[PDB]
């Protein structure tokens, strides 16, 4: 910052993801694989930022790795901080993104990902109310993205 | 985010700024006004992000407010965390930016800003060695910006 003294707060982990909207304002979400009979929760395409690599590039890379979609970062939306039980800090970065044209959703099925898909604003609202969105920040950023693009707001 | 539980670490303040490079790779820096007064230290154009407002837009706004230059954010470079003595956290955001053409540097002289100017890579290296760069992160991000644009690295 400026001249008022402050100490450094080391952030060991950083993650980057995107709020990817299509032409209708639907959001691209990734689902966790399980949790016995409960479905895994949903989150935005996002993954770890390699130490030293640009978080913006990581967001783009991760989106493609998880959904098979090449995306273009449109605008930075925000970053927020979390702390694991052991004290490790993680800074999550989020960008508004748009998919490049002529692509087919093809999720990467792993022990961490069950699938990925576009969800409408209306159904997202239901998922959120149902407690199926892992990080509530997803709703906050989806709302921001909708406003930025000029789409109607969540129900 | 991705299912391992973590707590929220509230960040009360957010700042946004830019590493603005011209066609030669010179960097735009802002100088503090004093304190034993002579020679205030240098920092990138940066200012407080209004609560709720987009940090990227804030970086662009602040750059214009402090230097008189309208700038275009080119790419996100990074964000880092600091803590004031009272415990308040501040998250600083940095973008690589380019000035729009046909502009004249016209700094905003206030009780916080002595002036602003473009400094060459060579002189920046001297300023840094001389301990005249308030936040060392400035050198780290300047280095990142130079690599991104394809300019030679700092001495
Ligand atoms: N408890 C705990 N969790 C950790 C630790 N280190 C990493 N993690 C977890 O490992 C994750 C690393 O993945 P990350 O890059 O954040 O990806 P992500 O985008 O959050 N996952 P997604 O979105 O696919 O579910 C963190 O989000 C965090 O949950 C640790 O020391 N302790
Ligand atoms: N010690 C201390 N200083 C504070 C606190 N809040 C604000 N400040 C000081 O007040 C200044 C202005 O507020 P802040 O939002 O941090 O400014 P900024 O936009 O980040 N500044 P800059 O653009 O120059 O980096 C800061 O640069 C910091 O020096 C606080 O709780 N404790
Ligand atoms: Mg990964
Ligand atoms: Mg200000």
From Swiss-Prot, chains A, B:
Keywords: ATP-binding, Hydrolase, Magnesium, Metal-binding, Nucleotide-binding. Gene3D superfamilies: Nucleoside Triphosphate Pyrophosphohydrolase (3.90.79.10). A motif (Nudix box) lies at residues 47-68. Mg(2+) 1 binds at residues 1, 46, 92. Mg(2+) 2 binds at residues 50, 62. Pfam families: NUDIX (PF00293). GO terms for molecular function: ATP binding; hydrolase activity; metal ion binding. Binds 3 Mg(2+) ions per subunit. Transmembrane segments: none annotated. Its cofactor is Mg(2+). ATP binds at residues 1-6, 47-48, 84-86. It is an enzyme of class 3 (hydrolase). It catalyses: 8-oxo-dGTP + H2O = 8-oxo-dGDP + phosphate + H(+); 8-oxo-GTP + H2O = 8-oxo-GDP + phosphate + H(+); P(1),P(4)-bis(5'-adenosyl) tetraphosphate + H2O = AMP + ATP + 2 H(+). It comes from the Bacteria. InterPro entries: Nud_hyd_Dein (IPR048157), Nudix_hydrolase (IPR020476), NUDIX_hydrolase-like_dom_sf (IPR015797), NUDIX_hydrolase_CS (IPR020084), NUDIX_hydrolase_dom (IPR000086). Belongs to the Nudix hydrolase family. Hydrolase that can act as a nucleoside triphosphatase and a dinucleoside polyphosphate pyrophosphatase. The best substrates are 8-oxo-dGTP and 8-oxo-GTP. Other substrates include Ap4A, dGTP and GTP. May be involved in protection from damage caused by radiation. This is Nudix hydrolase DR_1025. The lineage of its organism: Bacteria, Thermotogati, Deinococcota, Deinococci, Deinococcales.
């Amino acid at each position: 910052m400026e001249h008022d003294e402050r100490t450094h707060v080391p952030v060991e982990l950083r993650a980057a993801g995107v709020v990817l909207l299509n032409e209708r304002g639907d959001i691209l979400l990734v689902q966790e694989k399980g949790i016995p009979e409960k479905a895994g929760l949903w989150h935005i395409p996002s993954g770890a930022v390699e130490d030293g690599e640009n978080p913006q590039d990581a967001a783009v890379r991760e989106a493609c790795e998880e959904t098979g979609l090449r995306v273009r970062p449109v605008k930075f939306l925000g970053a927020y901080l979390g702390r694991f039980p052991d004290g490790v800090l993680i800074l999550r970065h989020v960008w508004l993104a748009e998919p490049e044209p002529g692509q087919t959703l093809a999720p990467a099925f792993t022990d961490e990902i069950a699938e990925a898909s576009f969800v409408s604003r209306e159904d997202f609202a239901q998922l959120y109310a149902a407690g199926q969105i892992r990080m509530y920040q997803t709703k906050l950023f989806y709302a921001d993205a909708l406003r930025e693009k000029g789409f109607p707001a969540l129900p």
